[PDB]
């Protein structure tokens, strides 16, 4: 059992709790940390080289950047930064969240997640995504309520943490059934838009 502490940060209302709750076993075996006001979800993923567990730290409160306690960030080995693609201000604060991560955890693999892409009225489009030089910052579209691209942040983090590029999830975990449809035509267009933008930066 290899396991990694993963901190899930971003503005309130971006969908962090909805997102981590999709993993059913991690919800049923979650742990509350009374001293820190935090829920640790033990998320298991089954790779071709064995089980990996991400112990995902989810806040219970709507604290701003630099509002979380020190113990939240302690021993964090990876992170997900989340924003809402229908709220530009949440994306404006992604750099702020990123500073806090470097300040207290130095160099950890980080994934950037634009959530709620199931909504048609998307404000933050792929053309508006500021891509960066560092290879510790990958972007993924996701829709928590539809499980769209749920496994992609974890697969990327697993590959960087384990140091193996060909690491595969042999199966998807048991996820909560979708509460909304991710329109496949939107998905097909967004995937292509993202591919052209990442080729530029």
């Amino acid at each position: 059992q290899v396991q990694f502490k993963l901190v899930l940060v971003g503005d309130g209302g971006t969908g962090k709790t909805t997102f981590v709750k999709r993993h059913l076993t991690g919800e049923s075996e979650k742990k509350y940390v009374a001293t820190l006001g935090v829920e640790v979800h033990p998320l298991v993923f089954h790779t071709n080289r064995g089980p990996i567990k991400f112990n995902v730290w989810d806040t219970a409160g709507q604290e701003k950047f630099g509002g979380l306690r020190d113990g939240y960030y302690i021993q964090a080995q990876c992170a997900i930064i989340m924003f809402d693609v229908t709220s530009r201000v949440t994306y404006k604060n992604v750099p702020n969240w990123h500073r806090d991560l470097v300040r207290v955890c130095e160099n950890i693999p980080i994934v950037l997640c634009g959530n709620k892409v199931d909504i048609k009225d998307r404000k933050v489009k792929a053309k508006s995504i500021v891509f960066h030089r560092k290879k510790n910052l990958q972007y993924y579209d996701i829709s928590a309520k539809s499980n769209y691209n749920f496994e992609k942040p974890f697969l990327w983090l697993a590959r960087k943490l384990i140091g193996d590029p060909n690491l595969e999830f042999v199966a998807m975990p048991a996820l909560a059934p979708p509460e909304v449809v991710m329109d496949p035509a939107l998905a097909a267009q967004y995937e292509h838009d993202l591919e052209v933008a990442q080729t530029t930066a």
Binding site: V2, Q3, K5, K31, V33, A34, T35, L36, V38, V40, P42, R49, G50, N55, G71, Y72, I74, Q75, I162
Partner: protein
């Protein structure tokens, strides 16, 4: 292949039962949440 004991727990290390952080032998309380190590 497996993970080849890449992330083996050192002899003195202990995993906190409350928050799952891996602590060093010298730590008597967990470094993240301050839960006592048994």
């Amino acid at each position: 292949m497996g993970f080849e004991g890449m992330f083996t727990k050192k002899e003195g290390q202990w995993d906190c039962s409350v928050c799952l952080v891996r602590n060093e032998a010298s730590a008597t309380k967990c470094i993240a949440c301050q839960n006592p190590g048994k």
